[PDB]
Design a protein around this ligand. Structure first.
Ligand SMILES: Nc1ncnc2c1ncn2[C@@H]1O[C@H](COP(=O)(O)OP(=O)(O)NP(=O)(O)O)[C@@H](O)[C@H]1O
Ligand SMILES: Nc1ncnc2c1ncn2[C@@H]1O[C@H](COP(=O)(O)OP(=O)(O)NP(=O)(O)O)[C@@H](O)[C@H]1O
Ligand SMILES: Nc1ncnc2c1ncn2[C@@H]1O[C@H](COP(=O)(O)OP(=O)(O)NP(=O)(O)O)[C@@H](O)[C@H]1O
Ligand SMILES: O=C(Nc1ccc(Br)cc1)c1ccc(Br)c(S(=O)(=O)NCc2ccccc2)c1
Ligand SMILES: O=C(Nc1ccc(Br)cc1)c1ccc(Br)c(S(=O)(=O)NCc2ccccc2)c1
Ligand SMILES: O=C(Nc1ccc(Br)cc1)c1ccc(Br)c(S(=O)(=O)NCc2ccccc2)c1
Ligand SMILES: [Mg+2]
Lengths: 310, 310, 310
DNA sequence: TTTTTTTTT
């Protein structure tokens, strides 16, 4: 990803890119993917500075018709961080892909908050072992972030705890309004240094009670839409894997049906439905993935994170 | 479709047709179907160059009253690419027609992007097998284009993967503004070589979040109208089949009702409502087609694309 | 309707009537109903040739005060083609009258494009069966003309398909500018031979996207006004029935309200609001007719056109 | 004059 200063060398004033920075653009792809009104909304930017900036953004970033063979190549050179459970990796055909959005929902105690802790330490791994050689960042809305589990999985893999903890960045969000500002600050960090995956634990927990619907329902869904649209751009412009978790309602007609509705159902690329088995064993079923066929597999929650039963 | 150079042989200056080209006209039908102000808007074109160009466009393209018998003939010689599921073809009475717009909507996981992957490979087929002997082009707004499925269906039909992948053209759109520029570049390609169908996967996904309505609603609908009007001209002047997909809202009155409103409901010629059955089985119900009576049929999503259950 | 040559026998030069012909006048009523400036606008016509031509036009066409009894007679000898559904005919008190404008609007799939296909074949019928013994002409702006339905209704009534298809004339319009030229060519045909009804399917579909308002709204409405004024003269001077269809917007105040505004609302004589019932059943409600009281009735869309449920 | 959006327990 080319920094936003590379088009400063193409007839753009300095305070212009500086204002784009407070707007939130830090690379040239963030501008090339941006629509016209997103840019015009910046206060102190004309309507012709806009067509110029978009022109050199399109010059520096190819945004036209290619053919399927070149897309097939990149699709083969994606990274797909492993999950730490060999059968889960077989189900996902290699693990959580980079550059897309995954979703994990379930009743409770189903380990959807523990898979995240496992991934946050597995990402720091050489590719010959299933990692991505990049830092993680963790956005929590519940307070359930526990570094004691990262330490256990770090000992499982050999990595030192101090070296896994000069790593995954913690930010606890108190508001649906605060989540988006965290996304801005996260974009800054991800441009200044290399990151492998973002984790939004309970991406929908705060909405359920911030927006007391119905009558507030339409605004809740509109806010979710924008949040997911921002996550999508982060994924597309930084190649990071985005993993979100989701809560569950009880379908009362006379039955889990995760929350969020059609707006999250359409937005998410891959969804994983987690169940409760015997003891530590859990069942993970594939839910809405194009390439992956519908199937399910088993895994366990050990003292070292996601496992196999075991 | 006659190229735009054939009227350059009728008293038109060369830079005139060259400027029509940057305007976007590449055939004589693109000009014959164009209104007067569409042409006057081109900078460097008079108001009399306009009546001239329209005069020889109407000379080269018959645009008057015919009688029903000659329309009945062409209606019988349309192509109607097959879908790859024998019962779906029976429901559609031969498959997706060429020269019109079809629409497929549904909750999620209902295989409306998998039908697109099947069609993108079925189009490259001799007419004695249900194809159209033409390339496809795929416009994606979500990232869900996977050539791994085109490869599977190519093995089902015998065609070689390298020969199905020197084919369907991929372009990922990041903006409602970018979709239209993609349409221009697509018109260029479709005039320079033969194409069979265009696929706009998630034709309405980007609007839902680009235009945060209401107050932006009227502009969103006006942009959709122009996008669909351009698709209609592409279809009419190149005989390609246009297949678009559509998302769904939850009708909250006290219930799917696809998104887009009356502007897409009126514009689309045939609509298909997809449902979720048991396992891989899905149900496809006819929705707003003149000739086709309202009915429904079943089909399955196999490891080789759309099937039959099976 | 007397041809325009009958006043050529009253001291008018031949090239004068020939120029009136390119102007668009083909009968003496087209001139008697024409205002003065309509005629003066013809290039190569003086201002005294005008008062002369108007003088003998008024001599040949009575345009003064009559009394109500003689109007009551013609009102009783109008034709009112049937619709093909006995309850619809009871609602309309005999069907679609000749010499006026009717309007049918609705969301979509409501059969307003199928009633037109039924009428286009019902018009070719002896008066003792509800027809008008005249050809039809169909102006399409969407491409939804299907002779396969005319064939089905022709088999329902006994008439042979080849004899219903040496009949209804098809012309597809691509522009609001092209609609009017089609009207001119239609006037020529209707004077050279007998016609019973004109059908403008989607009379307002092209305006919604040709005129991107507001700022273009006032011009859009002015163009609609002229189009409807020309339809009115066609109806008055040829006794044909004019049936137009109309799309729908969503009334957003906090609700269908067809498009076109006060200009089409005032111009249309009778309006029919179509709804969606169960299965094939639809509901047709009377909307703005002087003589007809407000009421509604049911009908169905069968494999042979408009029906009864059935 | 023009333009629909949004599930929860
Ligand atoms: N240190 C540990 N060693 C072994 N098992 C543990 C440990 N910590 C938690 N568990 C188990 O992990 C299971 C999964 O809990 P958890 O993943 O936190 O719930 P969750 O998936 O986040 N759902 P939610 O309650 O909505 O957050 C629990 O039922 C515990 O029994
Ligand atoms: N390789 C595959 N083999 C078998 N089944 C598959 C395969 N890939 C995807 N599927 C199934 O295809 C189904 C349809 O998913 P998909 O068509 O991608 O959703 P969609 O129609 O595009 N709706 P949306 O989520 O809004 O894009 C999924 O539920 C999967 O179970
Ligand atoms: N051959 C047929 N046999 C039986 N029913 C049919 C047939 N063709 C179409 N229909 C039905 O006719 C209904 C009316 O569709 P149609 O009349 O074309 O829409 P419309 O009134 O023109 N509204 P619009 O979509 O804006 O054009 C559809 O819902 C179909 O189910
Ligand atoms: O994706 C966008 N921005 C963005 C911002 C921060 C990051 Br990190 C990543 C992406 C984006 C796309 C279209 C429009 Br229009 C706009 S907008 O004009 O600014 N309207 C608010 C809004 C915001 C987000 C999504 C939708 C609407 C933004
Ligand atoms: O269909 C049109 N163009 C087009 C362009 C590219 C392709 Br590929 C295919 C078609 C067209 C029709 C009428 C007018 Br008026 C115009 S306009 O003057 O240029 N206004 C903008 C606009 C654009 C599109 C639809 C509506 C309005 C364009
Ligand atoms: O109804 C008219 N003409 C016509 C033309 C073709 C047919 Br078929 C049927 C009727 C007519 C009436 C008054 C005037 Br003033 C004029 S005008 O001078 O020519 N102005 C343009 C215009 C055209 C139409 C309506 C309004 C204005 C025409
Ligand atoms: Mg899809």
């Amino acid at each position: 990803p080319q920094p936003i200063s590379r088009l400063e060398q193409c007839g753009i004033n300095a305070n212009d890119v500086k204002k784009l920075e407070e707007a939130g653009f830090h690379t040239v792809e963030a501008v090339a993917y941006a629509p016209k009104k997103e840019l015009i909304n910046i206060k102190g930017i004309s309507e012709a500075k806009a067509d110029k900036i978009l022109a050199e953004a399109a010059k520096l970033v190819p945004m036209g018709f290619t053919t399927a063979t070149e897309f097939h190549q990149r699709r083969s050179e994606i990274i797909q961080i492993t999950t730490g459970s060999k059968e889960l990796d077989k189900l996902l055909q290699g693990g959580i892909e980079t550059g897309s959005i995954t979703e994990m929902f379930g009743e409770f105690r189903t380990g959807k908050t523990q898979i995240c802790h496992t991934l946050a330490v597995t990402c720091q791994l050489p590719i010959d072992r299933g990692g991505g050689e990049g830092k993680a960042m963790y956005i929590d809305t519940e307070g359930t972030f526990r570094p004691e589990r990262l330490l256990a999985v770090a000992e499982r893999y050999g990595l030192s705890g101090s070296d896994v903890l000069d790593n995954v960045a913690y930010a606890r969000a108190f508001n649906t309004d605060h989540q988006t500002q965290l996304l801005y600050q996260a974009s800054a960090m991800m441009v200044e240094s290399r990151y492998a995956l973002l984790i939004v634990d309970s991406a929908t927990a705060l909405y359920r009670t911030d927006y007391s619907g119905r009558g507030e329902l339409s605004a809740r869904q509109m806010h979710l839409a924008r949040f997911l649209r921002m996550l999508l751009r982060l994924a597309d412009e930084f190649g990071v894997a985005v993993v979100i978790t989701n809560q569950v309602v009880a379908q009362v007609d006379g039955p889990k049906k995760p929350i969020g509705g059609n707006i999250i159902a359409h937005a998410s690329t891959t969804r994983l439905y987690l169940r409760k088995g015997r003891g530590e064993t859990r069942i993970c079923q594939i839910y809405d993935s194009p390439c992956l066929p519908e199937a399910e597999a088993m895994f366990a929650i050990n003292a070292d994170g996601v496992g196999d039963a075991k």
